Symmetry: D2
Subunit: 165 residues, 4 copies
């Protein structure tokens, strides 16, 4: 397919580890969504890192820039935590190796393995956005496309919204 | 630009009824998917019919053409059963009142209310396709866009594929 | 330390599964195996499939075959998963068999298939397993978080519930 | 015959709060399991406290003893976190107001709102156990009944086991 999928952990991939009575960043949830989507080929993703927003580092962010630049595909999906998605998307937007590529960041406010998740919808929408949008770096959430330069995460209302005018 | 959703029943919307001890075509599952999607914009969901592929008629297919034609929006998602999705899509492609509209048909091989369903992914994918594709009539399934004129449903593989 | 419990499956609503090629439900693999897989059980328990019928296709020959299998079991604690529409008739028939004299036999199932959202199946299986281990010798129906005497019970098909006669 | 159900929080009740990106102890999951169990009457529970195993106190434990002793019912289910369950069960075992009551503690190693949870099976089994066992205090987990004086939680293996 023309699409390459990268994962950088975050809320979307959280799973319960019963040995510590708490969530960890687990197996990439996009693999679980694509498993039941009846795709033509084997499910194929790249798992870059498995951090949550607290232990994600600038080194982890540069590693994403290098992985995406080395991909041969020009249509790119990156699943990520929402708390520092804008920071990653603005960083990728300044990399010249990404000039001709459509790069879409998405994830979920609720882990896929928790009831009532936005994850599967967001993954479908984001896959289609990555295929169909003109070259650029975008955030796809809430069934819409956000310009990362003009967007912030509101942690309190769990949503992306326009920056302060 | 705003999306309008029309529903025509099919597998995607099947639900268990205790008294039938069996499935019936239920409330549109797209509304359940959009509920947990934390949407930025308002989306109208209009139910045109609640049939399965066995009791969906040519009269039902004409009624969908009339409702899509009367829609003010140029971005339309229609949820439908897969067994005759190609026939509906080919019919809508022939209608002059759909010039300038992007109309995407989608649905699910497995009911949304059954474990292991393609429905939520296919709804996300088809919503974006309806917003982003140029005017025309399309089928969005298997994370791909199909041209209805060059596509068929393989019943046994439970897949859409190119003719040839 | 093996469970005193043997589980027999005879099909019914509990086990219904969606088949793509038919665009509808068929009686599938026993849902009790899926529930016990996530139950973290202490004791080994045998699940034996006797039949894969719904209540519409069930015969007097099938019921006689179920009575022979239960009677031949070594265990004195038996769970039988079954459709609800013919449960009372199976339970009354098992109640008449001398080979079942020393045994606790509990029939249960679900009004909604395990594999459909909003199912009573996992609750019913937990309740019925405990009932089969703890009740005095006899034949019982376990549904609605209660124990029913088959001779004094019927299925109200309209209300989708077992009730006193 | 009548069962009284009390909840004290723990793993079974954890729910994701998207405003903090983490789990909190939430609405008692037993209400969700009983909702789909098609019971004869309204689902009725007593929500005593909403601690996890790390914030639960000997005062919270004594408050459960007072609540269970005030119940008119002689069949009692208490949902609880597993890491503190043996100490609660042993404490209730010592209370004279509980002498003629069957008191069953249960819960789940995985929250009910996370996929692949033991919660619904465990509630079904423990409801039956509370109705059927002789007076005493018991832990119902792993499809069997444990004597709390002879039992410990193995945190690493997520299981109750004999001391042994
Ligand atoms: Cl995160
Ligand atoms: Cl259909
Ligand atoms: Cl049946
Ligand atoms: Cl069916
Ligand atoms: Cl806990
Ligand atoms: Cl957490």
């Amino acid at each position: 397919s023309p699409l390459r999928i990268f994962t950088a952990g975050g809320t979307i991939d959280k799973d319960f580890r019963l040995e510590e009575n708490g969530l960890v960043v687990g197996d990439p949830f996009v693999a679980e969504v694509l498993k039941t989507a009846r795709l033509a080929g084997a499910v194929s993703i790249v798992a870059l890192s498995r951090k949550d927003s607290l232990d994600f580092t600038e080194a982890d962010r540069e590693a994403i820039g290098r992985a995406v630049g080395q991909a041969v595909e020009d249509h790119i999906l990156l699943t990520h935590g929402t708390d520092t998605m804008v920071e990653t998307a603005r960083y990728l937007g300044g990399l010249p190796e990404l000039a001709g590529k459509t790069v879409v960041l998405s994830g979920a406010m609720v882990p896929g393995r928790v009831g009532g998740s936005d994850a599967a919808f967001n993954i479908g929408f984001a896959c289609a956005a990555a295929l169909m949008l003109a070259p650029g770096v975008y955030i796809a959430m809430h069934g819409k496309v956000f310009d990362p330069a003009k967007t912030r995460k509101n942690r309190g209302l769990g949503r992306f919204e326009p920056i302060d005018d």
